[PDB]
Amino acid sequence: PPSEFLDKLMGKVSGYDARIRPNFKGPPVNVTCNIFINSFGSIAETTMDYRVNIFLRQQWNDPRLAYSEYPDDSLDLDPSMLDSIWKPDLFFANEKGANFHEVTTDNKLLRISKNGNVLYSIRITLVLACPMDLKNFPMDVQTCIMQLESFGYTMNDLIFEWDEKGAVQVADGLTLPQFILKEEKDLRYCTKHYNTGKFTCIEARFHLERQMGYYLIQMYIPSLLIVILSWVSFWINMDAAPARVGLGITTVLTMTTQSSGSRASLPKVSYVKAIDIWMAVCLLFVFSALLEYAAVNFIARQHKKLFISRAKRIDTVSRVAFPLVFLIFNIFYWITYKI
């Protein structure tokens, strides 16, 4: 029958004790890790988090769990008897949360080969955390870290290793609303040293690039709109204008309110993000409109024919000057950040 073989091993007779470890008082046991990414979640910028759903596979060779009476190789087992094996401890350092699923049954896979190799697959959801540098907020490349350690065992007992081929496998068709996940991923070692001792650790890092599509429509084009709109003052009327003040102020005021929304979603940071310098420099240009007019207005009132001629002369010079100086700022700003 099927039943005795399941009972003969992993059973009270000739007892397999889960507490002890494979190759006890001997060389450290090798663990090979594979990760498959089912879905990549929302990267909420406010709380430095990104949700990841993965299948985690661990492969190791337990010499005790070996058989030769059954000729079939790699027989599968019920996930309901997983309690009586040695399983290697594993945890993610950068986590903030984790859970299993338990939809209908226990979503775990156990596979035992003839020699003793064991494959163990678990479905887990992770909310990891990523340090970020927002020096150039609209045009930036970010790095996300996946880091695996052992909690209760040192390198004299347990060592982690990455799989030789296909270590991290992205599901086909995965795409993010605001990030492109580059297919080049770097795998490196980062050993943890604490006062208790050394623990094994592996690290896989992803690179993400942010595209400038949404920001142009939402922010840059309305910001470029106002400064052009404020420019109407030069040809709107002659020097006699209460209205010329009116256009200038409402453009200045709405620029500040648009500034608040720009970083409202983003986390507060001391350093000067590249999005601020665009708004701050553009803020001066609309601000400079009123100062020019008051200089014009002052010249007009100082008449007590040559004075009036100067007032027009100021305008004509500045009609050509402002497009020129704005061009200089526009070419310099975009070139340096793209490079």
Binding site: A98, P131, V245
Partner: protein, 332 residues
């Protein structure tokens, strides 16, 4: 054959896990140190922060001395079989809530020696409450605590003491807003006395952190400053700008009025002044003081010699410069 031999110590000899080590005698002394993996999420609104810690309790049990079972210096007990020994009933008193971290195996460590010591280590995520002093908001220094105490055992049985070498160890953590410091008070005695039960041990660690001023200067001051600077240009403008001087004043005060409420939106509901409110009101008065000077210019003309404008162009920028000097020096 070397699994049942050491399990003899715990079960087959009746090690009763409901009985304290060194019973009917001296109290047990616990050496404690904490490791802080992740510091972040300091929310003013709900008056709490979140930290991830590695609590490491250490005591000495006379029954479990490993008497020649094995020849090693240390015996690495697996994370399992942690329900057959005595453990201190530590709990935090500023805890809003806490939870364990179970991913794959449980994150627990048990590390017994020959001398009967125990080095249990445990991973926790704790939400702790921190009272905040916001009388000086933009240039602030905040003080937080952690309180470890035993719920069930009195001081004559359980005593908590901080390690000698390194009680708290940072892990290259950096905060987005606050600038933490590398020196901690770390000592306290905190010993309690509840009515009808008696004494209990406690010991606390105090974390000194300081806020950064970069964001506020660009977010709050620099927009405010230019709005005040903006109103100076009305003095040059002719007094016959009938509905030009009037907006130049009223649109500046409503913008500031709408601004000041929004600026103090995130912060909690507190009665005391906070010195960001001083700046907003002083700027609101100056913008208002720009409006009234035009209205008096209008009243006296309709009766000339309107010299009020000719000196106001000197006085208003000049007085604002002196107020800036006092404010910055005082709050420093």
């Amino acid at each position: 054959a070397n699994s049942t031999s050491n399990i003899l110590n715990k079960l087959l000899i009746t090690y009763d896990p409901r009985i304290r080590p060194n019973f009917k005698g001296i109290p047990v002394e616990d050496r404690v140190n904490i490791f802080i993996n992740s510091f972040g999420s300091i929310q003013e609104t709900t008056m709490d922060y979140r930290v991830n810690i590695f609590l490491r309790q250490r005591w000495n049990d006379p029954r479990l001395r490993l008497p020649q079972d094995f020849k090693s210096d240390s015996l690495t007990v697996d994370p399992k079989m942690f329900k057959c020994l005595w453990k201190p009933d530590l709990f935090f008193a500023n805890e809003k809530s806490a939870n364990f971290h179970d991913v794959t195996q449980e994150n627990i460590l048990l590390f017994i020696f020959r001398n009967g010591d125990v080095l249990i280590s445990m991973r926790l995520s704790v939400t702790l409450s921190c009272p905040l002093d916001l009388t000086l908001f933009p240039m602030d220094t905040q003080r937080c605590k952690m309180q470890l105490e035993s719920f069930g055992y009195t001081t004559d049985d359980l005593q908590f003491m901080w390690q000698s070498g390194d009680p708290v160890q940072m892990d290259e953590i950096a905060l987005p807003q606050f600038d933490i410091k590398q020196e901690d008070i770390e000592y306290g005695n905190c010993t309690k006395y509840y009515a009808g039960t008696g004494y209990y041990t406690c010991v606390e660690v105090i974390f000194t952190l300081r806020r950064q001023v970069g964001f506020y200067m660009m977010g709050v001051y620099a927009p405010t400053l230019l709005i005040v600077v903006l109103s100076w240009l009305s003095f040059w403008i002719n007094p016959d700008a009938s509905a030009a001087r009037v907006p130049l004043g009223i649109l500046s005060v409503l913008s500031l009025s709408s601004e000041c409420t929004s600026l103090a939106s995130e912060l909690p509901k507190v009665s005391y002044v906070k010195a960001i409110d001083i700046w907003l009101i002083a700027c609101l008065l100056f913008g208002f003081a720009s409006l009234v000077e035009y209205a008096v210019v209008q009243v006296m003309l309709n009766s000339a010699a309107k010299r009020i404008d000719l000196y106001a162009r000197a006085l208003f920028p000049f007085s604002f410069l002196f107020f800036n000097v006092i404010y910055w020096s005082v709050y420093l």
